[PDB]
GROMACS .gro file of C-alpha atoms in nm:
model
  330
    1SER     CA    1  -2.022   1.581 -21.811
    2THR     CA    2  -1.904   1.889 -21.492
    3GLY     CA    3  -2.053   2.009 -21.222
    4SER     CA    4  -2.062   2.388 -21.035
    5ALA     CA    5  -2.141   2.420 -20.689
    6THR     CA    6  -2.125   2.708 -20.468
    7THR     CA    7  -1.992   2.683 -20.072
    8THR     CA    8  -2.098   2.968 -19.849
    9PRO     CA    9  -1.940   2.986 -19.492
   10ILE     CA   10  -2.101   2.891 -19.185
   11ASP     CA   11  -2.024   3.158 -18.946
   12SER     CA   12  -1.900   3.453 -18.972
   13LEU     CA   13  -1.510   3.421 -18.959
   14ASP     CA   14  -1.495   3.148 -19.252
   15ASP     CA   15  -1.458   2.881 -18.937
   16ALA     CA   16  -1.605   2.577 -19.203
   17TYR     CA   17  -1.807   2.684 -19.562
   18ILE     CA   18  -2.145   2.402 -19.680
   19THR     CA   19  -2.239   2.326 -20.002
   20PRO     CA   20  -2.495   2.175 -20.117
   21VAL     CA   21  -2.585   1.854 -20.254
   22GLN     CA   22  -2.888   1.597 -20.401
   23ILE     CA   23  -2.891   1.348 -20.260
   24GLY     CA   24  -3.160   1.016 -20.342
   25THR     CA   25  -3.488   0.999 -20.553
   26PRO     CA   26  -3.657   1.240 -20.493
   27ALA     CA   27  -3.388   1.444 -20.368
   28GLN     CA   28  -3.268   1.503 -20.056
   29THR     CA   29  -3.021   1.823 -20.009
   30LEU     CA   30  -2.841   1.831 -19.724
   31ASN     CA   31  -2.496   2.105 -19.661
   32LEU     CA   32  -2.272   1.972 -19.672
   33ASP     CA   33  -1.789   2.003 -19.530
   34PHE     CA   34  -1.586   1.949 -19.836
   35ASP     CA   35  -1.315   1.764 -19.739
   36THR     CA   36  -1.076   1.755 -19.870
   37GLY     CA   37  -0.920   1.591 -19.620
   38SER     CA   38  -1.047   1.258 -19.560
   39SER     CA   39  -1.223   1.055 -19.733
   40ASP     CA   40  -1.572   0.868 -19.637
   41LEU     CA   41  -1.897   1.093 -19.803
   42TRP     CA   42  -2.141   1.061 -19.421
   43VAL     CA   43  -2.460   1.237 -19.343
   44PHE     CA   44  -2.716   1.321 -19.033
   45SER     CA   45  -3.014   1.126 -19.087
   46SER     CA   46  -3.291   0.972 -19.009
   47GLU     CA   47  -3.108   0.657 -18.798
   48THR     CA   48  -2.871   0.901 -18.589
   49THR     CA   49  -2.964   0.981 -18.242
   50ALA     CA   50  -3.221   1.120 -18.156
   51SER     CA   51  -3.021   1.305 -17.843
   52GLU     CA   52  -2.690   1.400 -18.086
   53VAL     CA   53  -2.941   1.546 -18.359
   54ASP     CA   54  -3.053   1.938 -18.321
   55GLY     CA   55  -3.137   2.136 -18.626
   56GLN     CA   56  -2.948   1.932 -18.881
   57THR     CA   57  -3.087   1.808 -19.233
   58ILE     CA   58  -3.176   1.441 -19.204
   59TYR     CA   59  -3.118   1.192 -19.501
   60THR     CA   60  -3.423   0.945 -19.435
   61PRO     CA   61  -3.347   0.641 -19.686
   62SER     CA   62  -3.682   0.506 -19.660
   63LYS     CA   63  -3.835   0.805 -19.796
   64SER     CA   64  -3.549   0.783 -20.175
   65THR     CA   65  -3.672   0.469 -20.419
   66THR     CA   66  -3.279   0.447 -20.523
   67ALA     CA   67  -3.102   0.411 -20.162
   68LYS     CA   68  -3.010   0.065 -20.126
   69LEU     CA   69  -2.862  -0.140 -19.837
   70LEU     CA   70  -2.514  -0.179 -19.891
   71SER     CA   71  -2.593  -0.516 -19.709
   72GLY     CA   72  -2.324  -0.523 -19.399
   73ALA     CA   73  -2.156  -0.247 -19.412
   74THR     CA   74  -1.986  -0.031 -19.149
   75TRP     CA   75  -1.773   0.260 -19.079
   76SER     CA   76  -1.703   0.482 -18.805
   77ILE     CA   77  -1.419   0.784 -18.848
   78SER     CA   78  -1.241   1.032 -18.614
   79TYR     CA   79  -1.090   1.366 -18.748
   80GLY     CA   80  -0.794   1.559 -18.681
   81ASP     CA   81  -0.969   1.758 -18.463
   82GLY     CA   82  -1.146   1.533 -18.186
   83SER     CA   83  -1.510   1.447 -18.286
   84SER     CA   84  -1.624   1.170 -18.496
   85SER     CA   85  -1.885   0.973 -18.639
   86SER     CA   86  -1.974   0.657 -18.754
   87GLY     CA   87  -2.317   0.434 -18.947
   88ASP     CA   88  -2.425   0.223 -19.124
   89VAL     CA   89  -2.436   0.237 -19.596
   90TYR     CA   90  -2.678   0.335 -19.883
   91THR     CA   91  -2.578   0.304 -20.166
   92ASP     CA   92  -2.754   0.601 -20.396
   93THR     CA   93  -2.791   0.892 -20.638
   94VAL     CA   94  -2.557   1.151 -20.602
   95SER     CA   95  -2.539   1.508 -20.761
   96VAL     CA   96  -2.315   1.901 -20.702
   97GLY     CA   97  -2.445   2.159 -20.910
   98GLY     CA   98  -2.554   1.932 -21.181
   99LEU     CA   99  -2.268   1.685 -21.191
  100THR     CA  100  -2.493   1.347 -21.064
  101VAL     CA  101  -2.353   0.965 -20.967
  102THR     CA  102  -2.560   0.688 -20.940
  103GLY     CA  103  -2.430   0.456 -20.670
  104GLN     CA  104  -2.237   0.624 -20.430
  105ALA     CA  105  -2.138   0.518 -20.110
  106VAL     CA  106  -2.410   0.707 -19.883
  107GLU     CA  107  -2.234   0.654 -19.545
  108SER     CA  108  -2.491   0.719 -19.321
  109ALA     CA  109  -2.406   0.867 -18.912
  110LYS     CA  110  -2.520   0.630 -18.586
  111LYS     CA  111  -2.357   0.819 -18.343
  112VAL     CA  112  -2.154   1.186 -18.418
  113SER     CA  113  -1.960   1.358 -18.130
  114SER     CA  114  -2.092   1.648 -18.000
  115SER     CA  115  -1.913   1.908 -18.119
  116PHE     CA  116  -2.115   1.843 -18.521
  117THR     CA  117  -2.441   1.812 -18.275
  118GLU     CA  118  -2.324   2.101 -18.146
  119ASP     CA  119  -2.253   2.249 -18.555
  120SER     CA  120  -2.642   2.271 -18.729
  121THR     CA  121  -2.511   2.411 -19.059
  122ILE     CA  122  -2.284   2.144 -19.169
  123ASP     CA  123  -2.513   1.800 -19.256
  124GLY     CA  124  -2.247   1.581 -19.291
  125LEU     CA  125  -1.940   1.591 -19.475
  126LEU     CA  126  -1.834   1.471 -19.845
  127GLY     CA  127  -1.477   1.427 -19.801
  128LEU     CA  128  -1.277   1.474 -20.121
  129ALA     CA  129  -0.884   1.316 -20.060
  130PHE     CA  130  -0.748   0.980 -20.226
  131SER     CA  131  -1.012   0.650 -20.155
  132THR     CA  132  -0.708   0.502 -19.984
  133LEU     CA  133  -0.829   0.650 -19.690
  134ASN     CA  134  -1.219   0.570 -19.689
  135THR     CA  135  -1.335   0.389 -19.335
  136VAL     CA  136  -1.687   0.194 -19.463
  137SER     CA  137  -1.578  -0.235 -19.370
  138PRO     CA  138  -1.594  -0.479 -19.490
  139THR     CA  139  -1.577  -0.288 -19.895
  140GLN     CA  140  -1.289   0.034 -19.867
  141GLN     CA  141  -1.582   0.247 -20.069
  142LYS     CA  142  -1.452   0.544 -20.346
  143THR     CA  143  -1.563   0.897 -20.261
  144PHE     CA  144  -1.720   1.106 -20.580
  145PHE     CA  145  -1.429   1.266 -20.693
  146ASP     CA  146  -1.338   0.882 -20.717
  147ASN     CA  147  -1.677   0.778 -20.906
  148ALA     CA  148  -1.706   1.100 -21.105
  149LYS     CA  149  -1.321   1.129 -21.286
  150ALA     CA  150  -1.446   0.868 -21.582
  151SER     CA  151  -1.769   1.066 -21.721
  152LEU     CA  152  -1.541   1.393 -21.645
  153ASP     CA  153  -1.483   1.633 -21.941
  154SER     CA  154  -1.092   1.651 -21.758
  155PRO     CA  155  -1.017   1.428 -21.430
  156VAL     CA  156  -0.989   1.730 -21.156
  157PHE     CA  157  -1.227   1.938 -20.915
  158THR     CA  158  -1.133   2.296 -20.819
  159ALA     CA  159  -1.171   2.471 -20.488
  160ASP     CA  160  -1.217   2.846 -20.492
  161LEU     CA  161  -1.312   2.955 -20.135
  162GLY     CA  162  -1.377   3.276 -20.074
  163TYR     CA  163  -1.270   3.562 -19.736
  164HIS     CA  164  -1.603   3.607 -19.587
  165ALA     CA  165  -1.824   3.601 -19.841
  166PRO     CA  166  -1.919   3.229 -20.021
  167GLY     CA  167  -1.717   3.083 -20.344
  168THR     CA  168  -1.727   2.772 -20.592
  169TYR     CA  169  -1.652   2.410 -20.649
  170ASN     CA  170  -1.601   2.313 -21.016
  171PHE     CA  171  -1.633   1.927 -21.094
  172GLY     CA  172  -1.429   1.889 -21.411
  173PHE     CA  173  -1.291   2.214 -21.534
  174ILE     CA  174  -1.079   2.512 -21.560
  175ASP     CA  175  -1.298   2.815 -21.475
  176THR     CA  176  -1.037   3.032 -21.662
  177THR     CA  177  -1.219   3.328 -21.577
  178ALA     CA  178  -1.198   3.299 -21.152
  179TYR     CA  179  -0.828   3.328 -21.122
  180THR     CA  180  -0.549   3.621 -21.211
  181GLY     CA  181  -0.184   3.515 -21.347
  182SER     CA  182  -0.136   3.175 -21.430
  183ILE     CA  183  -0.114   2.857 -21.263
  184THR     CA  184   0.114   2.642 -21.053
  185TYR     CA  185   0.084   2.352 -21.034
  186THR     CA  186   0.335   2.084 -20.753
  187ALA     CA  187   0.391   1.772 -20.698
  188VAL     CA  188   0.169   1.529 -20.527
  189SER     CA  189   0.260   1.258 -20.278
  190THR     CA  190  -0.088   1.045 -20.259
  191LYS     CA  191   0.158   0.760 -19.947
  192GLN     CA  192  -0.098   0.930 -19.706
  193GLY     CA  193  -0.420   0.915 -19.881
  194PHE     CA  194  -0.391   1.299 -19.885
  195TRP     CA  195  -0.364   1.641 -20.113
  196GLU     CA  196   0.051   1.586 -19.972
  197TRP     CA  197   0.273   1.868 -20.140
  198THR     CA  198   0.525   2.070 -20.049
  199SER     CA  199   0.584   2.445 -20.060
  200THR     CA  200   0.872   2.647 -20.133
  201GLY     CA  201   0.908   2.888 -19.857
  202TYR     CA  202   0.779   3.185 -19.645
  203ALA     CA  203   0.762   3.529 -19.609
  204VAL     CA  204   0.637   3.750 -19.294
  205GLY     CA  205   0.413   4.064 -19.420
  206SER     CA  206   0.738   4.281 -19.672
  207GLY     CA  207   0.961   4.092 -19.578
  208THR     CA  208   1.190   3.814 -19.726
  209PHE     CA  209   1.115   3.518 -19.862
  210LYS     CA  210   1.340   3.250 -19.725
  211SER     CA  211   1.290   2.959 -19.913
  212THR     CA  212   1.274   2.653 -19.715
  213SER     CA  213   1.027   2.296 -19.811
  214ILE     CA  214   0.738   2.282 -19.632
  215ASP     CA  215   0.526   1.979 -19.623
  216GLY     CA  216   0.181   1.971 -19.609
  217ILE     CA  217  -0.169   1.898 -19.736
  218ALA     CA  218  -0.412   2.066 -19.919
  219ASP     CA  219  -0.717   2.098 -19.673
  220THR     CA  220  -1.067   2.244 -19.732
  221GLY     CA  221  -1.188   2.082 -19.410
  222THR     CA  222  -0.958   2.204 -19.160
  223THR     CA  223  -1.013   2.602 -19.126
  224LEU     CA  224  -0.688   2.762 -19.021
  225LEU     CA  225  -0.307   2.703 -19.134
  226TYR     CA  226  -0.080   2.486 -18.959
  227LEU     CA  227   0.292   2.578 -18.958
  228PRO     CA  228   0.607   2.451 -18.810
  229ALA     CA  229   0.678   2.608 -18.481
  230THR     CA  230   0.997   2.788 -18.568
  231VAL     CA  231   0.772   2.972 -18.883
  232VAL     CA  232   0.455   3.042 -18.707
  233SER     CA  233   0.730   3.187 -18.434
  234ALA     CA  234   0.842   3.388 -18.763
  235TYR     CA  235   0.552   3.547 -18.799
  236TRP     CA  236   0.318   3.592 -18.509
  237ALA     CA  237   0.698   3.848 -18.372
  238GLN     CA  238   0.560   4.022 -18.544
  239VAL     CA  239   0.193   4.149 -18.348
  240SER     CA  240   0.293   4.357 -18.088
  241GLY     CA  241   0.158   4.157 -17.795
  242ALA     CA  242   0.051   3.813 -17.891
  243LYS     CA  243   0.166   3.496 -17.731
  244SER     CA  244   0.057   3.142 -17.740
  245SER     CA  245  -0.199   3.107 -17.488
  246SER     CA  246  -0.137   2.658 -17.272
  247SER     CA  247  -0.502   2.775 -17.213
  248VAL     CA  248  -0.656   2.944 -17.509
  249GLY     CA  249  -0.511   2.637 -17.688
  250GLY     CA  250  -0.269   2.853 -17.956
  251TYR     CA  251  -0.122   3.203 -18.090
  252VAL     CA  252  -0.373   3.447 -17.948
  253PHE     CA  253  -0.302   3.882 -18.055
  254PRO     CA  254  -0.409   4.189 -17.931
  255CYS     CA  255  -0.781   4.233 -18.103
  256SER     CA  256  -0.660   4.631 -18.174
  257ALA     CA  257  -0.355   4.487 -18.415
  258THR     CA  258  -0.352   4.507 -18.763
  259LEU     CA  259  -0.188   4.169 -18.891
  260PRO     CA  260   0.064   4.116 -19.200
  261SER     CA  261   0.033   3.909 -19.480
  262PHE     CA  262   0.201   3.560 -19.491
  263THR     CA  263   0.330   3.436 -19.812
  264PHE     CA  264   0.389   3.126 -19.874
  265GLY     CA  265   0.548   2.998 -20.192
  266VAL     CA  266   0.438   2.734 -20.499
  267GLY     CA  267   0.746   2.570 -20.722
  268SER     CA  268   0.860   2.956 -20.772
  269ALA     CA  269   0.495   3.214 -20.739
  270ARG     CA  270   0.410   3.346 -20.513
  271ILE     CA  271  -0.010   3.335 -20.238
  272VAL     CA  272  -0.060   3.580 -20.022
  273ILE     CA  273  -0.264   3.513 -19.764
  274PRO     CA  274  -0.359   3.903 -19.630
  275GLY     CA  275  -0.308   3.955 -19.270
  276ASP     CA  276  -0.767   4.030 -19.197
  277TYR     CA  277  -0.762   3.657 -19.295
  278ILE     CA  278  -0.608   3.613 -19.004
  279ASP     CA  279  -0.806   3.653 -18.726
  280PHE     CA  280  -1.052   3.453 -18.572
  281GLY     CA  281  -1.216   3.721 -18.366
  282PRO     CA  282  -1.193   3.707 -17.970
  283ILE     CA  283  -1.172   3.427 -17.814
  284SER     CA  284  -1.477   3.435 -17.649
  285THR     CA  285  -1.707   3.647 -17.659
  286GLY     CA  286  -1.636   4.013 -17.511
  287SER     CA  287  -1.260   3.926 -17.507
  288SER     CA  288  -1.021   4.179 -17.613
  289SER     CA  289  -0.783   3.844 -17.786
  290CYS     CA  290  -0.790   3.761 -18.089
  291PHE     CA  291  -0.734   3.429 -18.201
  292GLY     CA  292  -0.495   3.348 -18.478
  293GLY     CA  293  -0.549   3.200 -18.805
  294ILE     CA  294  -0.175   3.095 -18.794
  295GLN     CA  295  -0.052   2.797 -18.559
  296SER     CA  296   0.194   2.550 -18.534
  297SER     CA  297   0.143   2.260 -18.616
  298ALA     CA  298   0.402   1.978 -18.370
  299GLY     CA  299   0.189   1.744 -18.275
  300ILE     CA  300  -0.027   1.798 -18.566
  301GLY     CA  301   0.255   1.532 -18.742
  302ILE     CA  302   0.158   1.678 -19.038
  303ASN     CA  303   0.143   2.120 -19.159
  304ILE     CA  304  -0.189   2.205 -19.304
  305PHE     CA  305  -0.273   2.411 -19.604
  306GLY     CA  306  -0.607   2.492 -19.445
  307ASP     CA  307  -0.889   2.688 -19.561
  308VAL     CA  308  -0.688   2.983 -19.457
  309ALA     CA  309  -0.458   2.925 -19.634
  310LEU     CA  310  -0.622   2.760 -19.906
  311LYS     CA  311  -0.873   3.053 -19.973
  312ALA     CA  312  -0.597   3.328 -20.081
  313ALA     CA  313  -0.624   3.130 -20.381
  314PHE     CA  314  -0.729   2.931 -20.704
  315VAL     CA  315  -0.655   2.552 -20.588
  316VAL     CA  316  -0.662   2.267 -20.802
  317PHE     CA  317  -0.684   1.988 -20.762
  318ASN     CA  318  -0.609   1.713 -21.104
  319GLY     CA  319  -0.675   1.298 -21.010
  320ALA     CA  320  -0.491   1.234 -21.346
  321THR     CA  321  -0.319   0.895 -21.339
  322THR     CA  322  -0.058   1.087 -21.129
  323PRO     CA  323  -0.211   1.378 -20.967
  324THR     CA  324  -0.081   1.819 -20.886
  325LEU     CA  325  -0.251   2.019 -20.708
  326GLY     CA  326  -0.172   2.390 -20.926
  327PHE     CA  327  -0.238   2.750 -20.797
  328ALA     CA  328  -0.316   3.073 -20.861
  329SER     CA  329  -0.426   3.404 -20.696
  330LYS     CA  330  -0.725   3.555 -20.756
   0.00000   0.00000   0.00000
């Protein structure tokens, strides 16, 4: 089997991407944030504290003839940005772009933190990291990909995120029309539960390539590109007036600037992030100070190849017995 679904930016900055997901019988369609950096599929629901729902579409398990309460199961998660959610668990039928999993753990939110409440466009998350990170207790649950894997034509899914435009998540096949040149595959460590890999270096603008190992994770659920402070400093030094602002919480730059590209290495291959991809607009409405799309990972404890990086590539998440990651230009 295969699946194919369009993923759409939630706003004009590509702060995140939502993908429609069918849950239950009859189908309840929710727009979820596909997140290769976590492993819980959770949703706003009829059980969510009413004051914490503000415009989201909710899953109502009582209206699904295939929903079953997973007795005794609870979940609770906290994300790298400080947000969190928690609740109980159903199993139900979940389909993505024509691909159907029966008995998928659907984690029903009883509580969500303010940032989820405040984002009306995201109805929940669909985790696509390794199932070892799933928070369900006392019986850990499998991700949608993990449940679908055996049925898929090929044990893979691909992320093709658009810049200021829709893109595609595919399951079970590689669309050879969706990228240019060849796909370069690179080793993955699953030891931390992430799609963790090692980039072979970087360049800033038309600058020479610096060969250097950068360990990080491919994380569709993180907006920006988080790299070591040395790297990030080298980038922003090429932008007149750019500075790190502790009050804003990162590198800012004059909105009048033309940003240079940023290249990262995948083996011997190179992915180029256009400078425009690195502009996240005024820090506040009307400001002429703009927020940078490349930020320091110092104090996160891990480098993160988030949407800024991944949207410049066609990315293969290969879930074979020994997982690997593939990157192609597009």
